[PDB]
Amino acid sequence: ATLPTTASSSTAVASSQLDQLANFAYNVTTDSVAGCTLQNLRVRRDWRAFSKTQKKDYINSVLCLQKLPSRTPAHLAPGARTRYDDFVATHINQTQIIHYTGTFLAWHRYFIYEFEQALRDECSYTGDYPYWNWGADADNMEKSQVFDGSETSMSGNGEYIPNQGDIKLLLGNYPAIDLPPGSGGGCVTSGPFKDYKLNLGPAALSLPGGNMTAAANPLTYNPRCMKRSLTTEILQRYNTFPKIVELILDSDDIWDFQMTMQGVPGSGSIGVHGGGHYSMGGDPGRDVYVSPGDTAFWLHHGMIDRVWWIWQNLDLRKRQNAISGTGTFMNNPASPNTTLDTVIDLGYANGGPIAMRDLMSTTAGPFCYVYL
Amino acid sequence: ATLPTTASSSTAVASSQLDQLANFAYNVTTDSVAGCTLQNLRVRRDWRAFSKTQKKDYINSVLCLQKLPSRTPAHLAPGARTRYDDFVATHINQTQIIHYTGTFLAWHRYFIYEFEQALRDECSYTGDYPYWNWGADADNMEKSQVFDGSETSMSGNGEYIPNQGDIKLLLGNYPAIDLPPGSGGGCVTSGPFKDYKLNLGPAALSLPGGNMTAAANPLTYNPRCMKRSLTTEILQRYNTFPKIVELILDSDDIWDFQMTMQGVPGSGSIGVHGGGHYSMGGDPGRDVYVSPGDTAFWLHHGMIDRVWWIWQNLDLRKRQNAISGTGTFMNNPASPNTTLDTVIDLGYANGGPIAMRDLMSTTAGPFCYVYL
Numbered sequence: 134a135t136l137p138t139t140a141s142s143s144t145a146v147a148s149s150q151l152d153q154l155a156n157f158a159y160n161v162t163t164d165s166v167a168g169c170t171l172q173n174l175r176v177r178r179d180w181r182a183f184s185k186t187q188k189k190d191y192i193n194s195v196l197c198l199q200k201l202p203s204r205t206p207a208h209l210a211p212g213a214r215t216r217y218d219d220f221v222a223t224h225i226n227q228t229q230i231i232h233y234t235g236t237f238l239a240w241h242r243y244f245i246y247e248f249e250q251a252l253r254d255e256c257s258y259t260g261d262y263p264y265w266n267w268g269a270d271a272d273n274m275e276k277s278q279v280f281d282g283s284e285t286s287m288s289g290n291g292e293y294i295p296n297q298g299d300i301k302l303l304l305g306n307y308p309a310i311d312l313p314p315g316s317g318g319g320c321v322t323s324g325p326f327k328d329y330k331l332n333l334g335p336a337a338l339s340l341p342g343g344n345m346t347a348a349a350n351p352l353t354y355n356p357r358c359m360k361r362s363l364t365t366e367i368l369q370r371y372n373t374f375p376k377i378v379e380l381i382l383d384s385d386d387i388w389d390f391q392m393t394m395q396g397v398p399g400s401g402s403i404g405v406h407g408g409g410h411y412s413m414g415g416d417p418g419r420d421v422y423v424s425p426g427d428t429a430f431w432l433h434h435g436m437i438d439r440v441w442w443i444w445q446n447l448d449l450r451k452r453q454n455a456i457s458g459t460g461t462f463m464n465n466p467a468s469p470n471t472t473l474d475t476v477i478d479l480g481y482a483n484g485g486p487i488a489m490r491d492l493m494s495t496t497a498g499p500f501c502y503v504y505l
Numbered sequence: 506a507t508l509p510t511t512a513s514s515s516t517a518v519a520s521s522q523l524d525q526l527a528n529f530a531y532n533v534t535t536d537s538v539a540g541c542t543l544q545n546l547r548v549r550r551d552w553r554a555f556s557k558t559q560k561k562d563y564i565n566s567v568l569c570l571q572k573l574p575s576r577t578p579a580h581l582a583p584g585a586r587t588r589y590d591d592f593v594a595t596h597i598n599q600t601q602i603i604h605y606t607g608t609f610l611a612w613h614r615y616f617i618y619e620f621e622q623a624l625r626d627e628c629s630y631t632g633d634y635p636y637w638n639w640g641a642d643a644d645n646m647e648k649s650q651v652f653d654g655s656e657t658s659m660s661g662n663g664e665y666i667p668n669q670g671d672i673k674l675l676l677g678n679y680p681a682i683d684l685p686p687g688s689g690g691g692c693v694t695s696g697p698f699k700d701y702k703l704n705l706g707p708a709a710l711s712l713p714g715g716n717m718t719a720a721a722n723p724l725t726y727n728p729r730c731m732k733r734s735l736t737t738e739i740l741q742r743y744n745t746f747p748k749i750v751e752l753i754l755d756s757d758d759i760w761d762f763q764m765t766m767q768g769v770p771g772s773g774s775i776g777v778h779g780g781g782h783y784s785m786g787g788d789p790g791r792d793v794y795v796s797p798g799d800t801a802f803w804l805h806h807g808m809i810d811r812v813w814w815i816w817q818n819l820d821l822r823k824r825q826n827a828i829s830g831t832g833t834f835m836n837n838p839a840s841p842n843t844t845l846d847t848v849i850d851l852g853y854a855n856g857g858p859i860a861m862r863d864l865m866s867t868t869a870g871p872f873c874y875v876y877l
């Protein structure tokens with residue numbers, strides 16, 4: 134079998150191209166497994182592949198972390214109430230050193246893995262890690278099994294608010310990127326997270342109209358509802374199967390991969406990573422720091438990690454350990470290059486400090502899983 | 506009298522142009538003074554204008570802050586030992602929100618004012634705030650009364666180190682700016698600060714050759730000598746009287762002023778602000794975060810504040826309260842615009858929280874001084 138070399142403009146085959154690439158990556162991962170053996174190798178799976186009661190087992194475990202008390206010392210994050218908040222808080226705390234950095238991909242890989250460990254160790258979860266395949270939902274976000282509002286979604290849309298202005302995304306002094314406000318605006322109307330209390334932020338919440346709300350200290354207590362405004366137009370622009378495959382096949386090195394993924398500034402594109410986030414609309418959906426406060430975050434980054442994993446396995450010799458970038462957001466201010474010895478941590482959320490070299494592979498260090 | 510409209514290429518008259526502009530600014534400030542009256546109005550003065558024993562009164566007060574114990578809670582900055590360290594620590598702590606921000610100019614104005622208050626309130630200083638006029642020293646940094654190594658300098662050059670590679674200044678992914686390493690390299694050889702213990706950092710120290718050293722936590726204890734490597738070539742490139750006047754006269758709004766001053770990224774220029782800093786070479790001279798750990802910092806920023814003050818007084822109606830920019834370094838990540846209500850503080854160094862509106866004028870809020 135010879136793999137696709139050029140992304141198709143046809144949605145139907147772009148999807149199949151993606152599946153081929155994934156199959157190859159799956160093949161590479163499995164037979165390289167012949168700590169981590171084929172036996173104890175976990176499989177992360179598309180949300181759609183979960184059955185009703187499996188969906189709910191996951192949801193319930195998450196609701197469990199949203200009920201268990203926070204481990205973060207109150208004086209460090211006064212707003213944190215739950216174990217779940219512990220994760221949100223560390224993400225807020227470290228936002229300026231984990232996006233547009235050399236550590237971005239590996240940090241989020243570790244973040245979601247440790248989230249998973251919390252689910253298993255504290256909330257008795259025994260099911261698989263879920264991911265959200267953007268491409269399948271690119272035409273109707275409201276019908277996504279992740280966002281349909283049912284008892285098996287991560288809740289759905291937010292209360293509709295008429296005539297919201299556009300979202301204006303800034304970075305540096307580049308011209309804004311303009312996005313539609315979606316079909317919601319307010320508190321989520323249904324599903325398992327309808328009564329979920331969002332406790333932290335806003336740190337930097339983009340608002341319809343172009344304004345931004347920012348607490349003096351986004352780690353203080355600010356209990357409020359989760360708001361969404363599902364915006365299908367955004368997925369259509371940045372997260373279609375052709376766009377996904379394009380990112381994989383046109384990215385010749387780790388720099389181009391991660392930059393294309395996140396959206397290079399000034400380019401008018403926010404990539405699959407930005408698209409996934411901003412398509413949720415609402416709050417913290419539109420807050421780069423507080424985004425894990427939206428429960429769909431974990432599924433989104435499941436998919437982010439998948440896409441990275443695929444890209445790596447297309448040329449494992451060159452890509453397995455590939456790193457580019459520094460330890461500061463867009464290298465502002467300048468910091469040293471990230472290396473295999475760079476140490477990251479998730480503060481009080483879970484786990485301990487760990488070096489980049491131990492994160493590069495989904496079947497070494499603490500990791501032992503594959504994506505189906 | 507009609508003021509210069511175009512910066513002269515002649516060093517001799519560029520200097521006189523500067524003096525005219527300063528005189529005008531002085532005139533505006535005084536007669537606008539007709540809390541702050543002409544009576545209690547302080548005058549900040551060129552270091553050269555200080556007599557021997559006045560120089561030493563200032564130096565001694567600084568050495569006093571370098572001996573009095575730190576107020577910063579040990580658990581917040583384990584490295585801080587002295588009152589002086591309190592200031593360095595807050596600067597390190599806030600570096601990512603006080604450079605390339607809307608607050609940059611006003612924050613540093615408040616920083617040095619509160620430094621001054623520490624000198625007066627804790628170290629019995631009663632003399633004037635000094636500033637370093639770069640232009641007078643642009644041809645021979647070693648002969649500067651600030652850096653001559655005598656008992657009236659801020660110490661002088663560092664131990665000479667042969668064949669140091671160039672300094673390579675990065676920001677974002679723009680091409681590096683290359684600078685010569687100067688005539689020193691090591692510990693300062695003489696003057697009042699020869700035994701001054703530099704306690705904090707490095708946070709991001711640029712090294713000859715292009716490398717950068719960064720502690721895991723630059724607020725922890727790392728006692729070592731202050732190192733300089735006086736680099737006249739740098740002042741010659743960025744800090745000549747023509748360059749100073751150019752910044753004043755060619756900058757039509759606050760954005761262009763502050764950006765030209767700091768060096769716009771990608772432009773190959775580091776402005777009078779970068780030039781002043783990097784011309785000192787050494788450590789923390791080449792560390793954006795830790796720079797106040799070099800005792801010349803206060804004189805440099807005296808001059809920075811002067812240049813701003815002059816520019817403001819050229820059109821006080823439009824410039825007095827002018828602000829542009831956000832609350833994050835180069836607006837990475839994006840944050841709200843700075844406004845007159847934006848509140849800043851210097852943590853434990855001195856003073857309390859204060860709004861931008863109270864900082865805009867050297868003769869309102871807490872301020873009541875002029876530059877001669």
Ligand SMILES: *[C@@H]1O[C@H](CO)[C@@H](O[C@@H]2O[C@H](CO)[C@@H](O[C@@H]3O[C@H](CO)[C@@H](O)[C@H](O)[C@@H]3O)[C@H](O)[C@H]2NC(C)=O)[C@H](O)[C@H]1NC(C)=O
Pocket residue numbers: 205209210222223226227480481581583722724
């Ligand atoms: C947000 O990030 C900052 C910066 O990393 C975190 O501050 C860090 O806090 C921990 C302790 O709270 C420090 O760890 C060290 O622990 C050992 C004891 O095992 C002790 O010997 C050290 O002196 C230190 O306390 C870490 O150095 C410290 N870093 C800084 C710059 O203060 C903070 O915890 C994070 N906030 C949250 C809520 O996670």
Ligand SMILES: *[C@@H]1O[C@H](CO)[C@@H](O[C@@H]2O[C@H](CO)[C@@H](O[C@@H]3O[C@H](CO)[C@@H](O)[C@H](O)[C@@H]3O)[C@H](O)[C@H]2NC(C)=O)[C@H](O)[C@H]1NC(C)=O
Pocket residue numbers: 209211350352577581582594595598599852853
């Ligand atoms: C570096 O900057 C951080 C962020 O500003 C500083 O953390 C801040 O620390 C102070 C107290 O240490 C917090 O002030 C508040 O004081 C009142 C009591 O008057 C209390 O009710 C509040 O809950 C809070 O403790 C401030 O909110 C806090 N901010 C964060 C994000 O933790 C830190 O102090 C700075 N480090 C140094 C050495 O200056």
Ligand SMILES: *[C@@H]1O[C@H](CO)[C@@H](O)[C@H](O)[C@H]1NC(C)=O
Pocket residue numbers: 134153154156157160
């Ligand atoms: C994966 O390996 C299987 C089993 O040998 C093979 O049939 C299939 O063609 C491989 N997939 C790809 C995309 O190479």
Ligand SMILES: *[C@@H]1O[C@H](CO)[C@@H](O)[C@H](O)[C@H]1NC(C)=O
Pocket residue numbers: 341342343344
């Ligand atoms: C956005 O901010 C401006 C300036 O503070 C304010 O006047 C306005 O009310 C805000 N606009 C919206 C859409 O709320």
Ligand SMILES: *[C@@H]1O[C@H](CO)[C@@H](O)[C@H](O)[C@H]1NC(C)=O
Pocket residue numbers: 343344345829830842
């Ligand atoms: C931020 O200020 C700039 C001018 O410096 C202005 O163009 C922009 O509209 C402001 N942003 C908002 C949303 O207020």
Ligand SMILES: *[C@@H]1O[C@H](CO)[C@@H](O)[C@H](O)[C@H]1NC(C)=O
Pocket residue numbers: 506525526528529532
């Ligand atoms: C400053 O005011 C004095 C006193 O009237 C005047 O002689 C001088 O010309 C003024 N300076 C400038 C530069 O306008």
Ligand SMILES: *[C@@H]1O[C@H](CO)[C@@H](O)[C@H](O)[C@H]1NC(C)=O
Pocket residue numbers: 713714715716
């Ligand atoms: C700079 O860093 C490189 C890579 O770590 C190292 O090999 C080298 O020793 C350093 N160069 C200098 C000039 O010390």
Ligand SMILES: *[C@@H]1O[C@H](CO)[C@@H](O)[C@H](O)[C@H]1NC(C)=O
Pocket residue numbers: 457458470715716717
């Ligand atoms: C940082 O890494 C880049 C490649 O991504 C390399 O070009 C540069 O030399 C590195 N910086 C240093 C000084 O090691």
Ligand SMILES: *[C@H]1O[C@H](CO)[C@@H](O)[C@H](O)[C@@H]1O
Pocket residue numbers: 142143144145268271272369373374
């Ligand atoms: C296939 O459908 C996608 C949306 O899923 C479009 O983006 C593409 O142009 C093609 O029509």
Ligand SMILES: *[C@H]1O[C@H](CO)[C@@H](O)[C@H](O)[C@@H]1O
Pocket residue numbers: 514515516517640643644741745746
């Ligand atoms: C006057 O002298 C300055 C240095 O002080 C030069 O930069 C300028 O070109 C002129 O020779």
Ligand SMILES: [Cu+2]
Pocket residue numbers: 224231232241
């Ligand atoms: Cu993140």
Ligand SMILES: [Cu+2]
Pocket residue numbers: 406410424434
């Ligand atoms: Cu993300």
Ligand SMILES: [Cu+2]
Pocket residue numbers: 596603604613
């Ligand atoms: Cu500064």
Ligand SMILES: [Cu+2]
Pocket residue numbers: 778782796806
């Ligand atoms: Cu400075």
